[PDB]
Amino acid sequence: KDPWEQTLKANDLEVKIKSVGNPIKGDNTFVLSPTLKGKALEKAIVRVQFMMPEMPGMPAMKEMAQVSEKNGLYEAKTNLSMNGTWQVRVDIKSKEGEVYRAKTSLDL
Numbered sequence: 001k002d003p004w005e006q007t008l009k010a011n012d013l014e015v016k017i018k019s020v021g022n023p024i025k026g027d028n029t030f031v032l033s034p035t036l037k038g039k040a041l042e043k044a045i046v047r048v049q050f051m052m053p054e055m056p057g058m059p060a061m062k063e064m065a066q067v068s069e070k071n072g073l074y075e076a077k078t079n080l081s082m083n084g085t086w087q088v089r090v091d092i093k094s095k096e097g098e099v100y101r102a103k104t105s106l107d108l
Contacts, residue, residue, distance in 0.1 A: 004030075008090060012036060012100040015090060017037070023108050026084060032074040034092055034100075041073030045093040048076040050086045051104070060087070083108050 004019040013034055020029040031047065048065040065076035076106040080086060085107050092100040 004106060006104050008093070008104055009104040010090070010100040012042065013100045015092070015100075015102060017088075017104070018061065019089070019106075022086075023080070023106065025080060025108065027077070027079050030076045030078075031070075032090070033072075033074060034074070041092070041094060042072045043069070043095040044074075046074040046076070047091040048078070049089045050078055050080060051089070052082070052084050052086045054082075080108055 001022055004021045004023055006017050008015040013036055018031050020031070032046060032048070034044065034046070035053065040044055046067050046069070048067060050063040050065065051060040053060045063078045063080060065078040067074055067076045085105055088106055090102045095104045
C-alpha cells in the first residue's frame with residue numbers, strides 16, 4: 001500500500017518522485033519535486049518517459065507522460081498497461097535553458 005518513492009540527483013538538481021498510491025496496471029500519476037539548493041524549480045520544462053521491452057531484442061514499449069506544473073511540482077500522468085520493470089527517463093530544462101537528466105526504474 002505504500003507508494004513508490006525515489007530520490008534522484010542530476011548534477012546539482014535533486015528530483016524526488018512519488019507515485020499516487022502503490023502503482024498497479026493502468027492509469028498512474030507521479031509527482032516530481034525538483035529542487036536546487038532546496039528551492040523548487042519553477043517554470044521548468046519537465047518530461048518523463050516510461051520504457052519496457054516485452055522481451056529482450058524488441059523495441060521497448062514507450063509511454064510519454066503528460067506533465068503539468070503544479071506551482072514548482074510537476075504532475076506526470078501515464079498509462080502502464082503491463083506488469084514488469086519499466087525504465088524511467090527524466091528530462092528537465094530550466095526556464096533559463098539549462099538541461100538536466102536522470103534515469104531510474106519502476107517495478108510494476
